[model samples]
Target: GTSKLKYVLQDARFFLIKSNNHENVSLAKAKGVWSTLPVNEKKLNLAFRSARSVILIFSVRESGKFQGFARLSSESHHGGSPIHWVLPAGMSAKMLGGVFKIDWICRRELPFTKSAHLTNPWNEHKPVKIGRDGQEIELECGTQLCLLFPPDESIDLYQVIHKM
Candidate 1:
């Protein structure tokens, strides 16, 4: 049963994100595929609540080392999901189209240590997993998981995929 869990959650919370075109924008939490399968509504709601209204990004690797992460901030209010994301200062309209990525990992080794990085000074072995058991939802655009174009470019894109 334990082994089966791995397969079931191989890529459980995979998600993507980009900077907010407007100020005071918020980022939404990645939804759990399994928890949204009709039976785990409660679990899904709880996880989503924890991820929603957050201002950070996350990533992962086969071994789960210093995955990847980003933080967001804003000064204006923009229309988006139910998250409390505030576009960070220095953000520009052009930057909105910039690239970012999200891993939606199920673990959360808070304040990931540098040793977790493959190039750590200790040269630790592989599979340097980080974070705790919670998930790490992120917003990305540059990486392979670029989700949508600039906010003004489209409105239904995020909604379309999020519903999926």
Candidate 2:
């Protein structure tokens, strides 16, 4: 409806992923879960660990019954990888209910919520395991500017040499 700004200078569209099944938990819930995770610590360890202790699980309430279940998958480390895409520790769906995003680039898609063939499954409340095999969720801020890194960029070039 109008321009809702977050803060000074550092403003961008926040992105998040939600099971197509969980319609009741607004986009806001997803955003909150992404930001407050302990990414900084776990991120440093992802490459060596391959995966982390985090597991994302979701359930959706539809028409008086809960009808969806999925795991948000874990984060990846490598320092070179995108940070926002990683899910962090101490995170949950309730806290992640307020993320922001103007658009979603469906890098990955999931199957229908557990009630696909129940014939009015909307009236059925159940948790279905959706993201079971190496499926990760990428919730990103819909920024218009794409990041460009020059090839051969070095970690040495930026190293500071304290002038005596």
Candidate 3:
């Protein structure tokens, strides 16, 4: 195993979340579904709205068994809330599959998929409900880095900014 050089220049990790359930879908299939979703036109919206749409859901598969899941989001609107992570450079999906044993489940509109068990991980620690404004949500990986989501007004719709 070698450390591959990859640039973590921008806030590129917020769009990802870890899933606890496994879905029987290939990465290609999941990518297809995600790619077909309507692009979010609004700049800022509720966390619930942001989490479901425009996200990538990865399922960790092992020995034909479901281990866990990883959700990846590509939207990086706010510069303050940065999702920082480390990944090897020049890593292909094929290589990721073999090394991590993963599958995928693109975030969908289905109600069951949004369940607390499937999506929420802090049920026991500090329960978080959808639509609630989180003041400071920090997810850290040891001591290297941490992802931060600061609190904001939970506006259901996009508010227009007028130019002076």
Candidate 4:
């Protein structure tokens, strides 16, 4: 069948950031979760490389109020595994085990077969599917699928139940 040819991807990337004492957010830096899993790690790396932007949402707990958002700067890198992140600035960090949201979306869009993308805008590009005819590989995360998270107090990309 098309199992090998049906890798679905998104134009956007979302990450759930869970901080412990507010240090990770402040530095805009985080690592862990990304590991030896070929498919899993490959998916994340592709997202980091292709998507409009790599968004990071913050929440100290698995299920808590979103407090702020931040951008994953280019300085930090993660192509193989090991999710090491760094940000120039962070949120207020007032919520004591706070939660937040960040725009991993590009500061930008396009159009068509030229007109299709242009006339419909971002939302209309739903199901931003990929892996055409077995010509490509797909990375999956956040939005309708599942949110990704990194260890704030520990050292693992501990796949949380997505609430941040």
lDDT of 4 by residue, 42-77 (tens): 444565566654544443333233333333333223
lDDT value, candidate 4, whole model: 0.31
What is the TM-score of candidate 2? 0.19
lDDT of 3 by residue, 81-116 (tens): 222222236633222111111122212222222232
RMSD of each: 16.3, 16.6, 17.1, 16.6
lDDT of candidate 1 over 38-144, digit per residue (tens):
22233333443444322233333233233232222222222433333344566444333212222232223322243333221111322223332222333221121
Per-prediction TM-score to the true structure, in the order listed: 0.24, 0.19, 0.22, 0.31
Q: What are the Cα lDDT values of the candidates?
A: 0.27, 0.25, 0.23, 0.31
| TM-score leaderboard ranking | 4, 1, 3, 2
Write down the worst ten-residue block by lDDT for model 1.
141-150
Mark the 10 consecutive residues where model 3 has the least summed lDDT: 1-10
Candidate 4 or 2, higher lDDT: 4
Backbone clash count, each prediction separately = 25, 15, 6, 21
How much is 65 displaced in model 2, in angstroms? Answer: 14
What's the residue-level lDDT of 111 in candidate 2?
35
- For residue 155, model 4's alpha carbon misses the true position, in angstroms, by 31
Q: Compare the candidates by TM-score and give the number of the best one.
A: 4
Q: Candidate 4 regions off by >4 Å?
A: 1-10, 29-44, 78-164
Q: Which stretches of candidate 2 lie over 4 Å from their true place?
A: 1-25, 28-33, 39-103, 107-110, 113-164
